[PDB]
Amino acid sequence: ESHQYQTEVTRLMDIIVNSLYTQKEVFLRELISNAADALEKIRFLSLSDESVLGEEKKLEIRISANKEKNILSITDTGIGMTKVDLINNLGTIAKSGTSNFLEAISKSGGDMSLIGQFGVGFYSAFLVADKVIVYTKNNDDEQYIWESTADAKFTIYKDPRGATLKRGTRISLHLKEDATNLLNDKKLMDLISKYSQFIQFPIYLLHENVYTEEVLADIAKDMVNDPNYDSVKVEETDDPNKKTRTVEKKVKKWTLMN
Numbered sequence: 001e002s003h004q005y006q007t008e009v010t011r012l013m014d015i016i017v018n019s020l021y022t023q024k025e026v027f028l029r030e031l032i033s034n035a036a037d038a039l040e041k042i043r044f045l046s047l048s049d050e051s052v053l054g055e056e057k058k059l060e061i062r063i064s065a066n067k068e069k070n071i072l073s074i075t076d077t078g079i080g081m082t083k084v085d086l087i088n089n090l091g092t093i094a095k096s097g098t099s100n101f102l103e104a105i106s107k108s109g110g111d112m113s114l115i116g117q118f119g120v121g122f123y124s125a126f127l128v129a130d131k132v133i134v135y136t137k138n139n140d141d142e143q144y145i146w147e148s149t150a151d152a153k154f155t156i157y158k159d160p161r162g163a164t165l166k167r168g169t170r171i172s173l174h175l176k177e178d179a180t181n182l183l184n185d186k187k188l189m190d191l192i193s194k195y196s197q198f199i200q201f202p203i204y205l206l207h208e209n210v211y212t213e214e215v216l217a218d219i220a221k222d223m224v225n226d227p228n229y230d231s232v233k234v235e236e237t238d239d240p241n242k243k244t245r246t247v248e249k250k251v252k253k254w255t256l257m258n
Protein backbone atom coordinates (compact mmCIF):
# COMPACT_ATOMS: atom_id res chain seq x y z
CA GLU A 1 0.00 0.00 0.00
CA SER A 2 0.97 3.71 -0.77
CA HIS A 3 0.47 6.77 1.50
CA GLN A 4 -0.46 8.99 -1.54
CA TYR A 5 -3.29 6.50 -2.39
CA GLN A 6 -4.52 6.37 1.25
CA THR A 7 -4.82 10.20 1.34
CA GLU A 8 -6.46 10.54 -2.15
CA VAL A 9 -8.95 7.64 -1.70
CA THR A 10 -9.90 8.90 1.84
CA ARG A 11 -10.77 12.26 0.17
CA LEU A 12 -12.60 10.57 -2.77
CA MET A 13 -14.65 8.44 -0.31
CA ASP A 14 -15.31 11.45 2.01
CA ILE A 15 -16.57 13.73 -0.83
CA ILE A 16 -18.57 10.96 -2.65
CA VAL A 17 -20.22 9.85 0.65
CA ASN A 18 -20.86 13.48 1.84
CA SER A 19 -22.47 14.36 -1.54
CA LEU A 20 -24.46 11.18 -2.31
CA TYR A 21 -25.63 9.83 1.13
CA THR A 22 -29.23 10.75 0.09
CA GLN A 23 -28.82 8.89 -3.30
CA LYS A 24 -26.66 5.96 -1.87
CA GLU A 25 -28.24 3.57 -4.42
CA VAL A 26 -26.25 5.15 -7.34
CA PHE A 27 -23.22 2.87 -6.57
CA LEU A 28 -25.05 0.18 -8.62
CA ARG A 29 -25.25 2.49 -11.69
CA GLU A 30 -21.43 2.83 -11.49
CA LEU A 31 -20.61 -0.87 -11.01
CA ILE A 32 -22.95 -1.90 -13.91
CA SER A 33 -21.23 0.83 -16.06
CA ASN A 34 -17.72 -0.47 -15.14
CA ALA A 35 -18.89 -4.10 -15.89
CA ALA A 36 -20.29 -2.97 -19.31
CA ASP A 37 -16.89 -1.31 -20.13
CA ALA A 38 -14.92 -4.52 -19.19
CA LEU A 39 -17.33 -6.55 -21.41
CA GLU A 40 -16.96 -4.19 -24.41
CA LYS A 41 -13.11 -4.46 -24.17
CA ILE A 42 -13.17 -8.31 -24.49
CA ARG A 43 -16.15 -8.21 -26.98
CA PHE A 44 -14.23 -5.79 -29.25
CA LEU A 45 -11.13 -8.10 -29.27
CA SER A 46 -13.31 -11.21 -30.01
CA LEU A 47 -14.30 -9.61 -33.38
CA SER A 48 -10.58 -9.76 -34.39
CA ASP A 49 -9.93 -13.26 -32.83
CA GLU A 50 -12.90 -15.20 -31.26
CA SER A 51 -10.29 -17.35 -29.36
CA VAL A 52 -10.07 -14.68 -26.55
CA LEU A 53 -13.43 -16.01 -25.16
CA GLY A 54 -11.83 -19.46 -24.72
CA GLU A 55 -13.89 -21.64 -22.38
CA GLU A 56 -15.96 -18.57 -21.17
CA LYS A 57 -18.30 -17.80 -24.13
CA LYS A 58 -20.80 -15.86 -21.89
CA LEU A 59 -20.68 -12.01 -22.20
CA GLU A 60 -22.91 -10.74 -19.33
CA ILE A 61 -23.42 -9.07 -15.88
CA ARG A 62 -24.61 -11.14 -12.86
CA ILE A 63 -26.07 -9.64 -9.65
CA SER A 64 -26.54 -11.85 -6.55
CA ALA A 65 -26.95 -11.22 -2.76
CA ASN A 66 -26.07 -13.37 0.29
CA LYS A 67 -28.57 -12.21 2.99
CA GLU A 68 -26.79 -14.44 5.62
CA LYS A 69 -23.22 -13.06 5.04
CA ASN A 70 -24.61 -9.49 4.25
CA ILE A 71 -22.75 -9.58 0.87
CA LEU A 72 -23.93 -8.16 -2.53
CA SER A 73 -21.95 -9.37 -5.60
CA ILE A 74 -21.59 -7.86 -9.12
CA THR A 75 -19.87 -10.33 -11.47
CA ASP A 76 -19.14 -9.88 -15.20
CA THR A 77 -17.55 -12.18 -17.81
CA GLY A 78 -15.47 -9.21 -19.04
CA ILE A 79 -11.79 -8.68 -19.96
CA GLY A 80 -10.62 -9.00 -16.32
CA MET A 81 -7.44 -7.49 -14.83
CA THR A 82 -3.72 -8.39 -14.61
CA LYS A 83 -1.55 -7.57 -11.52
CA VAL A 84 0.21 -4.93 -13.72
CA ASP A 85 -3.10 -3.32 -14.88
CA LEU A 86 -4.33 -3.27 -11.26
CA ILE A 87 -1.11 -1.79 -9.71
CA ASN A 88 -0.57 0.74 -12.59
CA ASN A 89 -4.28 1.87 -12.55
CA LEU A 90 -4.30 2.27 -8.71
CA GLY A 91 -1.07 4.24 -9.18
CA THR A 92 -2.68 6.70 -11.64
CA ILE A 93 -5.60 7.34 -9.11
CA ALA A 94 -3.06 8.12 -6.27
CA LYS A 95 -1.11 10.77 -8.27
CA SER A 96 -4.08 12.31 -10.26
CA GLY A 97 -5.74 14.50 -7.57
CA THR A 98 -9.33 13.79 -8.79
CA SER A 99 -10.45 14.49 -5.18
CA ASN A 100 -9.38 18.14 -5.84
CA PHE A 101 -11.79 18.34 -8.84
CA LEU A 102 -14.60 16.72 -6.72
CA GLU A 103 -13.90 19.00 -3.68
CA ALA A 104 -14.16 22.04 -5.99
CA ILE A 105 -17.36 20.57 -7.59
CA SER A 106 -18.97 19.98 -4.13
CA LYS A 107 -17.98 23.44 -2.75
CA SER A 108 -19.57 25.01 -5.92
CA GLY A 109 -22.90 23.15 -5.49
CA GLY A 110 -22.21 20.75 -8.37
CA ASP A 111 -23.28 17.09 -8.54
CA MET A 112 -21.18 13.86 -8.48
CA SER A 113 -22.35 13.00 -12.06
CA LEU A 114 -18.73 13.13 -13.39
CA ILE A 115 -17.31 10.42 -10.98
CA GLY A 116 -17.81 7.82 -13.78
CA GLN A 117 -16.11 9.90 -16.56
CA PHE A 118 -13.20 10.67 -14.12
CA GLY A 119 -12.61 6.96 -13.39
CA VAL A 120 -13.38 7.07 -9.62
CA GLY A 121 -16.97 5.72 -9.81
CA PHE A 122 -15.85 2.44 -8.12
CA TYR A 123 -15.30 4.24 -4.73
CA SER A 124 -19.10 4.97 -4.61
CA ALA A 125 -19.35 1.34 -3.26
CA PHE A 126 -18.28 2.87 0.11
CA LEU A 127 -21.71 4.61 0.40
CA VAL A 128 -23.21 1.14 1.24
CA ALA A 129 -20.14 -1.12 1.99
CA ASP A 130 -17.33 -0.90 4.60
CA LYS A 131 -15.23 -3.56 2.74
CA VAL A 132 -15.10 -4.35 -1.00
CA ILE A 133 -13.38 -7.57 -2.19
CA VAL A 134 -12.63 -7.67 -5.95
CA TYR A 135 -11.82 -11.07 -7.54
CA THR A 136 -10.36 -10.69 -11.09
CA LYS A 137 -8.97 -12.99 -13.88
CA ASN A 138 -7.48 -11.82 -17.25
CA ASN A 139 -6.26 -14.34 -19.94
CA ASP A 140 -2.64 -12.90 -19.72
CA ASP A 141 -2.31 -13.56 -15.89
CA GLU A 142 -3.46 -15.59 -12.81
CA GLN A 143 -6.57 -14.86 -10.68
CA TYR A 144 -6.00 -12.05 -8.17
CA ILE A 145 -7.86 -10.59 -5.14
CA TRP A 146 -8.03 -6.80 -4.42
CA GLU A 147 -9.54 -6.06 -0.98
CA SER A 148 -10.42 -2.42 -0.05
CA THR A 149 -11.48 -1.01 3.36
CA ALA A 150 -13.47 2.21 4.22
CA ASP A 151 -10.22 3.57 5.84
CA ALA A 152 -8.53 3.65 2.33
CA LYS A 153 -6.52 0.49 3.29
CA PHE A 154 -6.09 -2.12 0.54
CA THR A 155 -4.24 -5.37 -0.37
CA ILE A 156 -3.60 -7.19 -3.69
CA TYR A 157 -2.73 -10.93 -3.83
CA LYS A 158 -3.10 -14.14 -5.93
CA ASP A 159 -6.31 -16.13 -5.33
CA PRO A 160 -5.38 -19.34 -3.35
CA ARG A 161 -8.49 -21.06 -4.87
CA GLY A 162 -7.04 -20.36 -8.38
CA ALA A 163 -8.82 -19.22 -11.59
CA THR A 164 -12.38 -19.75 -10.19
CA LEU A 165 -13.67 -16.98 -12.57
CA LYS A 166 -12.24 -18.32 -15.91
CA ARG A 167 -12.42 -14.69 -17.26
CA GLY A 168 -13.87 -11.48 -15.80
CA THR A 169 -14.31 -9.67 -12.48
CA ARG A 170 -16.39 -10.36 -9.31
CA ILE A 171 -17.08 -7.41 -6.97
CA SER A 172 -18.27 -8.46 -3.48
CA LEU A 173 -19.57 -5.75 -1.12
CA HIS A 174 -19.75 -6.37 2.69
CA LEU A 175 -22.78 -4.10 3.29
CA LYS A 176 -23.05 -1.82 6.32
CA GLU A 177 -25.96 -2.61 8.74
CA ASP A 178 -27.03 0.90 7.60
CA ALA A 179 -27.80 -0.42 4.00
CA THR A 180 -29.03 -4.10 4.39
CA ASN A 181 -32.21 -3.39 2.23
CA LEU A 182 -29.95 -3.90 -0.86
CA LEU A 183 -30.15 -7.67 -0.26
CA ASN A 184 -33.92 -7.50 -0.94
CA ASP A 185 -35.55 -8.84 -4.11
CA LYS A 186 -37.95 -5.90 -4.90
CA LYS A 187 -35.19 -3.25 -4.19
CA LEU A 188 -32.50 -4.84 -6.47
CA MET A 189 -35.05 -5.39 -9.31
CA ASP A 190 -36.19 -1.73 -9.11
CA LEU A 191 -32.51 -0.46 -9.05
CA ILE A 192 -31.31 -2.78 -11.88
CA SER A 193 -34.29 -1.77 -14.15
CA LYS A 194 -33.49 1.94 -13.47
CA TYR A 195 -29.66 1.72 -14.05
CA SER A 196 -29.59 -0.64 -17.09
CA GLN A 197 -30.97 1.96 -19.55
CA PHE A 198 -28.07 2.30 -22.06
CA ILE A 199 -26.58 -1.19 -21.28
CA GLN A 200 -25.92 -3.29 -24.44
CA PHE A 201 -25.07 -6.55 -22.53
CA PRO A 202 -27.46 -8.90 -20.59
CA ILE A 203 -27.95 -8.47 -16.84
CA TYR A 204 -29.05 -11.45 -14.73
CA LEU A 205 -30.36 -11.43 -11.14
CA LEU A 206 -30.20 -14.46 -8.78
CA HIS A 207 -33.49 -14.19 -6.87
CA GLU A 208 -35.83 -16.50 -4.85
CA ASN A 209 -38.47 -18.77 -6.47
CA VAL A 210 -41.10 -20.56 -4.35
CA TYR A 211 -42.76 -23.86 -5.44
CA THR A 212 -45.84 -24.66 -3.26
CA GLU A 213 -47.80 -28.01 -3.29
CA GLU A 214 -49.86 -30.35 -1.07
CA VAL A 215 -47.86 -33.40 0.05
CA LEU A 216 -48.77 -36.49 2.13
CA ALA A 217 -47.30 -36.07 5.67
CA ASP A 218 -44.78 -39.01 5.25
CA ILE A 219 -43.51 -37.68 1.86
CA ALA A 220 -43.24 -34.08 3.24
CA LYS A 221 -40.61 -35.27 5.81
CA ASP A 222 -38.57 -36.84 2.87
CA MET A 223 -38.85 -33.57 0.82
CA VAL A 224 -36.87 -31.69 3.56
CA ASN A 225 -33.85 -33.81 2.40
CA ASP A 226 -34.14 -32.68 -1.30
CA PRO A 227 -30.77 -30.90 -1.90
CA ASN A 228 -32.02 -29.39 -5.23
CA TYR A 229 -33.63 -26.63 -3.05
CA ASP A 230 -32.02 -24.04 -0.74
CA SER A 231 -34.81 -24.62 1.85
CA VAL A 232 -38.03 -26.66 2.22
CA LYS A 233 -40.67 -25.28 4.68
CA VAL A 234 -43.29 -27.88 5.79
CA GLU A 235 -46.65 -26.87 7.49
CA GLU A 236 -46.88 -27.60 11.25
CA THR A 237 -50.19 -28.97 12.62
CA ASP A 238 -51.50 -30.03 16.07
CA ASP A 239 -54.27 -32.02 14.22
CA PRO A 240 -53.53 -35.83 14.14
CA ASN A 241 -56.30 -36.44 11.53
CA LYS A 242 -54.33 -34.37 8.89
CA LYS A 243 -52.88 -36.78 6.31
CA THR A 244 -51.44 -33.86 4.21
CA ARG A 245 -49.17 -30.79 4.65
CA THR A 246 -48.51 -27.66 2.54
CA VAL A 247 -44.84 -27.66 1.50
CA GLU A 248 -42.85 -24.60 0.25
CA LYS A 249 -39.70 -25.43 -1.78
CA LYS A 250 -37.39 -22.39 -2.09
CA VAL A 251 -34.60 -22.09 -4.71
CA LYS A 252 -32.73 -19.02 -6.06
CA LYS A 253 -32.76 -18.75 -9.88
CA TRP A 254 -31.28 -16.40 -12.56
CA THR A 255 -33.66 -13.98 -14.32
CA LEU A 256 -32.76 -11.73 -17.30
CA MET A 257 -33.35 -8.14 -16.18
CA ASN A 258 -32.99 -6.43 -19.62
Ligand SMILES: CO[C@H]1[C@@H](OC)C[C@H](C)[C@@H](OC)C2=CC(=O)C=C(NC(=O)/C(C)=C/C=C\[C@H](C)[C@@H](OC(N)=O)/C(C)=C/[C@@H]1C)C2=O
Pocket residue numbers: 033034035037038041076078079080081085086089116118119120121122123134168169
Ligand atom coordinates in the same frame (compact mmCIF):
# COMPACT_ATOMS: atom_id res chain seq x y z
C1 LIG B 1 -8.10 -2.47 -18.65
O1 LIG B 1 -9.24 -1.75 -18.17
C2 LIG B 1 -9.52 -2.01 -16.79
C3 LIG B 1 -8.93 -0.89 -15.93
O2 LIG B 1 -7.51 -1.04 -15.94
C4 LIG B 1 -7.08 -1.82 -14.83
C5 LIG B 1 -9.31 0.50 -16.45
C6 LIG B 1 -8.81 1.66 -15.59
C7 LIG B 1 -8.86 1.36 -14.09
C8 LIG B 1 -9.58 2.96 -15.89
O3 LIG B 1 -9.41 3.33 -17.26
C9 LIG B 1 -8.14 3.95 -17.48
C10 LIG B 1 -11.03 2.84 -15.56
C11 LIG B 1 -11.93 2.23 -16.44
C12 LIG B 1 -13.28 2.10 -16.13
O4 LIG B 1 -14.06 1.53 -16.93
C13 LIG B 1 -13.80 2.58 -14.92
C14 LIG B 1 -12.99 3.20 -13.98
N1 LIG B 1 -13.54 3.68 -12.84
C15 LIG B 1 -13.26 3.28 -11.59
O5 LIG B 1 -13.85 3.82 -10.67
C16 LIG B 1 -12.26 2.25 -11.29
C17 LIG B 1 -11.26 2.53 -10.19
C18 LIG B 1 -12.22 1.08 -11.96
C19 LIG B 1 -11.21 0.05 -11.71
C20 LIG B 1 -11.45 -1.26 -11.77
C21 LIG B 1 -12.82 -1.81 -12.05
C22 LIG B 1 -13.33 -2.48 -10.77
C23 LIG B 1 -12.86 -2.79 -13.21
O6 LIG B 1 -14.24 -3.14 -13.37
C24 LIG B 1 -14.54 -4.46 -13.90
N2 LIG B 1 -15.78 -4.93 -13.73
O7 LIG B 1 -13.68 -5.12 -14.49
C25 LIG B 1 -12.42 -2.18 -14.51
C26 LIG B 1 -13.15 -0.98 -15.02
C27 LIG B 1 -11.42 -2.72 -15.24
C28 LIG B 1 -11.03 -2.15 -16.59
C29 LIG B 1 -11.63 -3.06 -17.65
C30 LIG B 1 -11.54 3.38 -14.28
O8 LIG B 1 -10.78 3.94 -13.46
